[PDB]
Amino acid sequence: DAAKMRRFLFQRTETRSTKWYQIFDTEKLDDEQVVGGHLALLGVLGFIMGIYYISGIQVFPWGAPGFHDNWFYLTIKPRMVSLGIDTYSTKTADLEAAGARLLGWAAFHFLVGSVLIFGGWRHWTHNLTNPFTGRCGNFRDFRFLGKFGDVVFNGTSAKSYKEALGPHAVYMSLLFLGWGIVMWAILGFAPIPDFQTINSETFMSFVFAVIFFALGIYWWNNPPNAAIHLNDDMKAAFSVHLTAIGYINIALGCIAFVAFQQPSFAPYYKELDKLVFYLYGEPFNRVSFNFVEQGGKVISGAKEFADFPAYAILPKSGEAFGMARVVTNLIVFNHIICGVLYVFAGVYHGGQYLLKIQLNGMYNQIKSIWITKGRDQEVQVKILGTVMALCFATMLSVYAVIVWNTICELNIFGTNITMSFYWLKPLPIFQWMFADPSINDWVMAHVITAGSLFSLIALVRIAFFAHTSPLWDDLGLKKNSYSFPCLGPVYGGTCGVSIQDQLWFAMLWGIKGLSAVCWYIDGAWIASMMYGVPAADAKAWDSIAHLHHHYTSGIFYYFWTETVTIFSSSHLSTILMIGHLVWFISFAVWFEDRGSRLEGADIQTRTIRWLGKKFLNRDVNFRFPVLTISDSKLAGTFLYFGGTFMLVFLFLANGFYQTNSPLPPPV
Amino acid sequence: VTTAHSDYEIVLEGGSSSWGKVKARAKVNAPPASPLLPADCDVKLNVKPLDPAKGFVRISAVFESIVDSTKNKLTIEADIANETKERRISVGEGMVSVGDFSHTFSFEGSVVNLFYYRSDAVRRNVPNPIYMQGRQFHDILMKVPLDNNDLIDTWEGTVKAIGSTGAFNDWIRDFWFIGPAFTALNEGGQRISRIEVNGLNTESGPKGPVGVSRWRFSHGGSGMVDSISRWAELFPSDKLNRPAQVEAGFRSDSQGIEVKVDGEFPGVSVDAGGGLRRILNHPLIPLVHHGMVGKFNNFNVDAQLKVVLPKGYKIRYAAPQYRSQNLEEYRWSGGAYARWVEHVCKGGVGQFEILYAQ
Amino acid sequence: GSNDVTTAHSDYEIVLEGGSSSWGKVKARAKVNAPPASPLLPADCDVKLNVKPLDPAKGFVRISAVFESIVDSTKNKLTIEADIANETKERRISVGEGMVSVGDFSHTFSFEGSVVNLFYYRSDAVRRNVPNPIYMQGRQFHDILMKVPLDNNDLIDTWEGTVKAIGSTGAFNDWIRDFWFIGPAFTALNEGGQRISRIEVNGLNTESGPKGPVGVSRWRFSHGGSGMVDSISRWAELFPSDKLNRPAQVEAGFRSDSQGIEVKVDGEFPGVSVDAGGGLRRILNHPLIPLVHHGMVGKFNNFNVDAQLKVVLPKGYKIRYAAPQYRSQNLEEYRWSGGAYARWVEHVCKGGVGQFEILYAQ
Numbered sequence A: 001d002a003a004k005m006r007r008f009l010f011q012r013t014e015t016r017s018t019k020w021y022q023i024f025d026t027e028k029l030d031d032e033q034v035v036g037g038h039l040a041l042l043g044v045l046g047f048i049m050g051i052y053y054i055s056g057i058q059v060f061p062w063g064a065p066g067f068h069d070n071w072f073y074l075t076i077k078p079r080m081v082s083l084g085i086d087t088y089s090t091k092t093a094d095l096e097a098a099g100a101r102l103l104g105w106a107a108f109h110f111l112v113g114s115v116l117i118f119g120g121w122r123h124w125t126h127n128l129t130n131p132f133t134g135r136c137g138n139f140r141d142f143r144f145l146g147k148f149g150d151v152v153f154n155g156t157s158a159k160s161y162k163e164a165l166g167p168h169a170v171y172m173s174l175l176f177l178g179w180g181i182v183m184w185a186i187l188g189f190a191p192i193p194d195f196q197t198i199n200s201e202t203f204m205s206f207v208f209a210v211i212f213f214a215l216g217i218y219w220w221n222n223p224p225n226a227a228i229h230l231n232d233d234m235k236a237a238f239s240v241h242l243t244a245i246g247y248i249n250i251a252l253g254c255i256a257f258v259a260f261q262q263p264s265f266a267p268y269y270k271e272l273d274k275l276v277f278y279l280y281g282e283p284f285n286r287v288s289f290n291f292v293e294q295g296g297k298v299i300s301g302a303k304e305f306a307d308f309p310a311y312a313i314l315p316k317s318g319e320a321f322g323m324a325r326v327v328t329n330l331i332v333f334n335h336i337i338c339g340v341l342y343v344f345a346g347v348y349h350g351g352q353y354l355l356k357i358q359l360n361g362m363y364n365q366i367k368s369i370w371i372t373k374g375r376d377q378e379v380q381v382k383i384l385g386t387v388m389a390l391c392f393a394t395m396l397s398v399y400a401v402i403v404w405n406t407i408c409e410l411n412i413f414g415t416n417i418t419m420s421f422y423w424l425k426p427l428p429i430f431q432w433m434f435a436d437p438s439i440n441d442w443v444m445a446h447v448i449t450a451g452s453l454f455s456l457i458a459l460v461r462i463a464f465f466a467h468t469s470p471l472w473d474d475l476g477l478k479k480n481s482y483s484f485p486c487l488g489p490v491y492g493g494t495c496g497v498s499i500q501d502q503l504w505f506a507m508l509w510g511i512k513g514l515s516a517v518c519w520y521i522d523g524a525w526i527a528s529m530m531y532g533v534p535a536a537d538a539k540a541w542d543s544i545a546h547l548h549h550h551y552t553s554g555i556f557y558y559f560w561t562e563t564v565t566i567f568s569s570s571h572l573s574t575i576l577m578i579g580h581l582v583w584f585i586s587f588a589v590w591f592e593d594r595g596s597r598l599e600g601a602d603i604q605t606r607t608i609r610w611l612g613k614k615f616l617n618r619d620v621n622f623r624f625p626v627l628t629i630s631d632s633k634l635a636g637t638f639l640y641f642g643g644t645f646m647l648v649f650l651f652l653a654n655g656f657y658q659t660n661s662p663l664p665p666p667v
Numbered sequence B: 001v002t003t004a005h006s007d008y009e010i011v012l013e014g015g016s017s018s019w020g021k022v023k024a025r026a027k028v029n030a031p032p033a034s035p036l037l038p039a040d041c042d043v044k045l046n047v048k049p050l051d052p053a054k055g056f057v058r059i060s061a062v063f064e065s066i067v068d069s070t071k072n073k074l075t076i077e078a079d080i081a082n083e084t085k086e087r088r089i090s091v092g093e094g095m096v097s098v099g100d101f102s103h104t105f106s107f108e109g110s111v112v113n114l115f116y117y118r119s120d121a122v123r124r125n126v127p128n129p130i131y132m133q134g135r136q137f138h139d140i141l142m143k144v145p146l147d148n149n150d151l152i153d154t155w156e157g158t159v160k161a162i163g164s165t166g167a168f169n170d171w172i173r174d175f176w177f178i179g180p181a182f183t184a185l186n187e188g189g190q191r192i193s194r195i196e197v198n199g200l201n202t203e204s205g206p207k208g209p210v211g212v213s214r215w216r217f218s219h220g221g222s223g224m225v226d227s228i229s230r231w232a233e234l235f236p237s238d239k240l241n242r243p244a245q246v247e248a249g250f251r252s253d254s255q256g257i258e259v260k261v262d263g264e265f266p267g268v269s270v271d272a273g274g275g276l277r278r279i280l281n282h283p284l285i286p287l288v289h290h291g292m293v294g295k296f297n298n299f300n301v302d303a304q305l306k307v308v309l310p311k312g313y314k315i316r317y318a319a320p321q322y323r324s325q326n327l328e329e330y331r332w333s334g335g336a337y338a339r340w341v342e343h344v345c346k347g348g349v350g351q352f353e354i355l356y357a358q
Numbered sequence C: 001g002s003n004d005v006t007t008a009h010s011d012y013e014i015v016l017e018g019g020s021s022s023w024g025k026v027k028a029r030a031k032v033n034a035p036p037a038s039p040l041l042p043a044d045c046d047v048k049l050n051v052k053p054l055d056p057a058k059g060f061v062r063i064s065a066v067f068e069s070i071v072d073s074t075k076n077k078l079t080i081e082a083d084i085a086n087e088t089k090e091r092r093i094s095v096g097e098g099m100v101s102v103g104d105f106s107h108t109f110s111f112e113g114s115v116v117n118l119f120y121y122r123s124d125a126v127r128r129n130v131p132n133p134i135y136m137q138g139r140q141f142h143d144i145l146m147k148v149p150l151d152n153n154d155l156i157d158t159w160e161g162t163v164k165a166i167g168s169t170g171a172f173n174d175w176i177r178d179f180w181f182i183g184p185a186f187t188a189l190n191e192g193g194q195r196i197s198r199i200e201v202n203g204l205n206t207e208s209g210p211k212g213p214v215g216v217s218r219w220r221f222s223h224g225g226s227g228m229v230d231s232i233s234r235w236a237e238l239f240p241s242d243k244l245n246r247p248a249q250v251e252a253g254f255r256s257d258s259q260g261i262e263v264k265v266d267g268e269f270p271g272v273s274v275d276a277g278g279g280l281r282r283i284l285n286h287p288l289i290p291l292v293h294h295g296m297v298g299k300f301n302n303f304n305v306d307a308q309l310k311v312v313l314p315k316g317y318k319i320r321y322a323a324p325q326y327r328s329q330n331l332e333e334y335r336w337s338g339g340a341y342a343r344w345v346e347h348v349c350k351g352g353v354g355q356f357e358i359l360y361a362q
């Protein structure tokens, strides 16, 4: 009746809505519910760690062929060899012990995770009753553990988050000491301050246990004040800690990248190059079209090799396939992308809280420095403008250097590779942080700076212009939803001004500066777009710049080289197809086409209703829903970012192929 | 240690109704400032509208208490109605008992509150006026049968004192404010004028002589005095369409205070203009009075406030900011709310306004 | 163990003037993370005081004060202009005009004022035996002739209410003090030693002025002090007109809030330092009333205030007997931080009057 339809597209409208992906929004969660959710998720984390340990079994000591290699366990196998729970052992006898140890640790993780999940469930339901004693614990005022909960934290459980930092630090000191004693007792590894063995890990676990305990005492008796995070800790403290964890995670990725290449880490990562890996989905022993089983020996349709019966997964060496740095790059890039995403999400959730306090006037009611700074509307403009100017300068300089390098490679306009930026290396005072310092590393540093500033532009726009901007201050407008996609074509268009869309743009902009890491950690010569290509002079880089290594290929030729192995395997090929499929579908929701989709969905609804009557019968009242531009942007950011980083994984997991033999000039 | 536990709840009603359930409990690990300890007290305030024709409401108040092992009791019935905007009349009776002594009283008193100014410039400019100076004029006729020997002795001593001591009018204020009550008088901005006794007499009542005391006094405030600054706000007789009851008490031993209060009464939510209701501005006299006793010990506080809005209503500008919104009920805990709770326990009158609309 | 922290930060700087001058730059920034005791919040205020010497012939100084404030989105303002002079050692005369505006309402005033300060005693035994007399009991006698044009309909209503209230009520003379000191102002009278006497209304007559009716108020009042009040005990020292050889300004302002207070103070005026004998000069004794007035409002949140004080002596001067002792000295300027000084800062923020005197000489 034209109104029954109207309260159908008045159901996805980007007003304030339920938004199923916000059921666990911190606004409706209290402190104890957060504790319980984190405990349950840590229990599930223990469950999946046990699953990974099970996937690490190769002999099943009770007697059976084991699991094939997989990235889920290959990314942690060096750690388990470091802890002595797994082995790089060539013999079944020492591998049965590793299987037994992994099975026992998986069972232990299952038990501990079940306990942790049950505790988190009881915290989630506000049910801290001890079934053995029948009493009930008080979340607001509890003794921590007992006598230990009285000598330190003399009763008086923390009532505020700034008052909870200290007991948390003491809890983390307990964690460090517990891990140290677990090392010392279960895993051997007595604490020796020899910073070249795993014993140093136990020693530094005890050192950090002492440090964290003292710091927790100090912050228990002298709580610090960020002030504002105490009130809306659901979003303020949560987002600040999220961006802090993002920076910590980027730092951890850098630590992993530096450490896993050191000689002290050789028996755990570099020794992966002496192994042979049988990965799921890799090229299997193929057979002809007329295989008739009857094992022991093939009769009709001889397979590729007489060995590896039927459809066995073919071996691949760890030296040609650089599994050492493949695993290193997987771990490092995982933690780097997670850190970048956590920084972006912390800025976004902080902008959410900050718009919430700008809407109710609490923004002017903040006393802490962290907002009294940006409550200026000019220091906001100055900061964003100087970030944009620095991003413009760095990005323009580095991109023009890259384009000139590519021109000199291809000899466009009759140029030559000696006209390129082969001389532009890091300073000798900066050459210590690179191996084989060249224009590639200079370009990497400047591309990292440019991409970080490019994403920082949108991060600053989230931080400052959550509710209003100098443009929207000059106009008679204000932002009051953090998720509204637009106000319309007025002023030529107002698309994507909310902090959610600014988050999406920050993610898309950081895609470049983050994939630049994938090129780098794979050694892919981002200093030019066509490297190693035999066009004019791209193979002369190794001689003109006196390179010591030989990186894979330039930015564009990186999709030709090392894709020879993505295509060579079925699993990586189907991942490539799925990633590209997911990625381009984001155009259906980022392109300014939502109303076209709504109109076409109305047409399809009328068609299906009519097609359900001309041929079928009965009412066809079902109608096609269209994702609104808020939902369209959310789904599009997910589709785009996942589509690109399901294939950055393919670049990372297809091999290293960054040989240390600089090829001679073409001459 | 000396940690302060307290749970507050506000269950509001929507529309024109201003009613709201108020139930709170509090635990304090500090010695109360009572020279007689331990002290226990129970108070029950029940109100029902006698005749909604012209404002009769029957307010009943029973104060049961035990201080240092003596049993105290004070019941008082009162039919209170507003003759006009500024005048109120109360008719009723009551009883006070301490130990084995008990004397029943009946009274017919009228209270006239007058504001010093009624300027429209302030009223139209300040949307939420807190301080509002003025005076009330209490005209009280209280009657007490003189059947006890102690009652007759009190009456004779008072008559002799008024006959002889001419300074009785201002020396009664020393007796009439027991101990720190006199200091609290000035702390809260109150000041009592000298009483004027319009007559003392006795006559043969239903069973014996009765002491009839026609006396008058007036006290004025500088703005904190919530009896004066907000005269009609403290007595919502117009919006009392059903019985209202409040049960409160505390068990205050020598090493702690155990507060318990219930409540169901109108006037919890007042319109603040622009279709925006608010929790009624916090009375200043309780805060400034408790601040003299709430400043004697350093205390940590874990105070939690429930504000259950009606169906569809939403809080806009809660300050200190609420912690967790859950459907239609709100929570305050820690952070600025704990700081504000400590502020108002120690003596501050800082504003914690909860504006809300539908 | 521990308690609630509720930290507060504050910086203070004193830049003294050389020679025999008592001048000195005074600036003080502060930030308190505690709710203020204002029942209407937020309550922001900006204050500007300026004085310039009209003429040294008979000690008139042109003093102006602008108080522009917002409390609960109500833009309040009160500007005054006055010409104040000491015609003798005990009597002060002031003539000037001003205005007050609140939201839409605004009314101007012009006042002829005379304040007479009488100490209850001037015994020489006290003078010759107490080198630093702090308490000094006395009476201030205010005689005010203020004229307000009754142009607004509210001003005429205020006049009609007041003149009808004075003639009909005999208790106006003392009940005026209840309205006069709104809210905590009345309570703060007794906790500072002040006693406000009944005002005598010499007459409320209205006559047509330059533009219309002008309400004229000739009324006197006298407030007494137990020696605890600075406006009485330190009456001579709070009006250094003799030492005002150049314009003096004090620009202050606080940003009160729902969960904090932010304070700025900038000052430049004489009387920052006084003498103590034999070329030994000292920073002026701290005024009693501000300390014991902020005390009854600054004891509601437990706080561990970290305060830094900076005293920049003029060239050739060295501090002798700073108590509490200065934490550091850069050979020309002295710095207070933590230790016993932070204890005194908390003491005076809670209302204590612990003597922190700084003496210096060349």
Ligand code: BCL
Binding pocket: B045, B046, B047, B059, B060, B061, B076, B077, B078, B080, B088, B089, B090, B108, B109, B110, B111, B136, B138, B140, B219, B227, B228, B234, B235, B244, B245, B246, B264, B265
């Ligand atoms: C407290 C501050 C002022 C004061 C302000 C008022 C106010 C305001 C009123 C009176 C009123 C009256 N006053 Mg008086 N009055 C004071 C001191 C006195 C003294 C004395 C010996 O000191 C006396 C005898 C009186 C006598 C009287 C009676 C004529 C009358 C109340 C009778 C009644 O209600 O009884 C029953 C006794 C009580 C109910 C005790 C409980 C009192 C407390 C303060 C009520 C708290 C209400 C609680 C916060 C919420 C209530 C919710 C429930 C639904 C009730 N007043 C002090 C100085 N007085 C009332 C009137 O108008 O009479 C015409 C009135 O509205």
Ligand code: BCL
Binding pocket: B096, B097, B098, B101, B102, B103, B105, B142, B143, B144, B150, B151, B152, B153, B154, B155, B158, B172, B175, B176, B195, B197, B211, B212, B213, B214, B215
């Ligand atoms: C407004 C006060 C309440 C009241 C509350 C109390 C309380 C509380 C107590 C007593 C107690 C007693 N009551 Mg009684 N009592 C009242 C009315 C009276 C009257 C009377 C003629 O109206 C009389 C003779 C008495 C007599 C007595 C005293 C003999 C006896 C113990 C001494 C004491 O301190 O009393 C207090 C005396 C007064 C507060 C009022 C005295 C009235 C005088 C005789 C007549 C009025 C004089 C003057 C005009 C009123 C001045 C104002 C009053 C100070 C409020 N009450 C009124 C209704 N009464 C004690 C008891 O019950 O058990 C030990 C006690 O603790």
Ligand code: BCL
Binding pocket: C049, C050, C051, C063, C064, C065, C080, C081, C082, C084, C092, C093, C094, C096, C112, C113, C114, C115, C140, C142, C143, C144, C223, C231, C232, C235, C238, C239, C248, C249, C250, C268, C269
């Ligand atoms: C504050 C304590 C005493 C008080 C003590 C004094 C003192 C002391 C003096 C007066 C003086 C005056 N008083 Mg008085 N007086 C008080 C209450 C009042 C009230 C009232 C309604 O309450 C009124 C109407 C008056 C009226 C007056 C006028 C008769 C006269 C000049 C007013 C003027 O110039 O403004 C001046 C006011 C300001 C400029 C606003 C700032 C006020 C504060 C106190 C100044 C702080 C100075 C700051 C610490 C340092 C400034 C240094 C810069 C160089 C300026 N007083 C209270 C009770 N009064 C003056 C006089 O003698 O006139 C003959 C004078 O010296």
Ligand code: BCL
Binding pocket: B117, B119, B121, B122, B125, C100, C101, C102, C105, C106, C107, C109, C146, C147, C148, C154, C155, C156, C157, C158, C159, C162, C176, C179, C180, C201, C215, C216, C217, C218, C219
């Ligand atoms: C000494 C105080 C300052 C002053 C400062 C303020 C302030 C502050 C405010 C007003 C405000 C108003 N002023 Mg004014 N105002 C003064 C002089 C006057 C005179 C007059 C004949 O002299 C009149 C009619 C008025 C009229 C008015 C009221 C109608 C109006 C709002 C009510 C209010 O609170 O009044 C306040 C009334 C007084 C403080 C003085 C009233 C004077 C009476 C009519 C004549 C003197 C009577 C008596 C002898 C002197 C008593 C001394 C006072 C108690 C201090 N003012 C003097 C100059 N005036 C309000 C406003 O501006 O915007 C809302 C307000 O907040």
Ligand code: G2O
Binding pocket: A581, A584, A585, A586, A587, A588, A589, A591, A593, A596, A597, A598, A599, A600, A601, A604
């Ligand atoms: C994968 C590629 C795409 C489709 C498949 C597709 C399908 C589609 N689109 Mg599209 N689209 C883009 C990509 C795709 N758009 C891009 C990149 C842009 C940006 C330029 C874009 C833009 C618009 C605008 C502007 C409008 C539409 C519509 C419109 C609808 C037409 C209805 C119809 O005739 O049926 C045609 C529908 C089909 C043939 C679907 C059959 C399945 C098949 C086997 C492909 C499988 C789907 C997928 C590959 C597998 C995922 C399944 C999952 C389980 C893993 C119809 C559903 C319009 C409407 O909604 O209404 C008319 C409209 O207005 N678009």
Ligand SMILES: CCCCCCCCCCCCCCCC(=O)OC[C@H](COP(=O)(O)OC[C@@H](O)CO)OC(=O)CCCCCCCCCCCCCCC
Binding pocket: A582, A585, A588, A589, A594, A597, A598, A601, A604, A607, A608, A624, A625, A626, A627, A632, A634, A635, A636, A638, A639, A640, A641, A642, A643, A644, A645, A646
């Ligand atoms: C007779 C007339 C025709 C009737 C039938 C025609 C309609 C049939 C269409 C059916 C199939 C539709 C074709 C596809 C439709 C298409 O391609 O358009 C994308 C589509 C949005 O479509 P609209 O809602 O605009 O309109 C489609 C309409 O057909 C009905 O909605 O949905 C998405 O945004 C997908 C994201 C869902 C959310 C997923 C987010 C990411 C989750 C994680 C996955 C990635 C992992 C991370 C990697 C980065």
Ligand code: SF4
Binding pocket: A485, A486, A487, A488, A489, A493, A494, A495, A496, A592, A593, A594, A629
């Ligand atoms: S194109 Fe889409 S997102 Fe942009 S303003 Fe128009 S409706 Fe909004």
Ligand SMILES: [Ca+2]
Binding pocket: A329, A522, A651, A652, A653, A654, A655, A656, A657
């Ligand atoms: Ca690779």
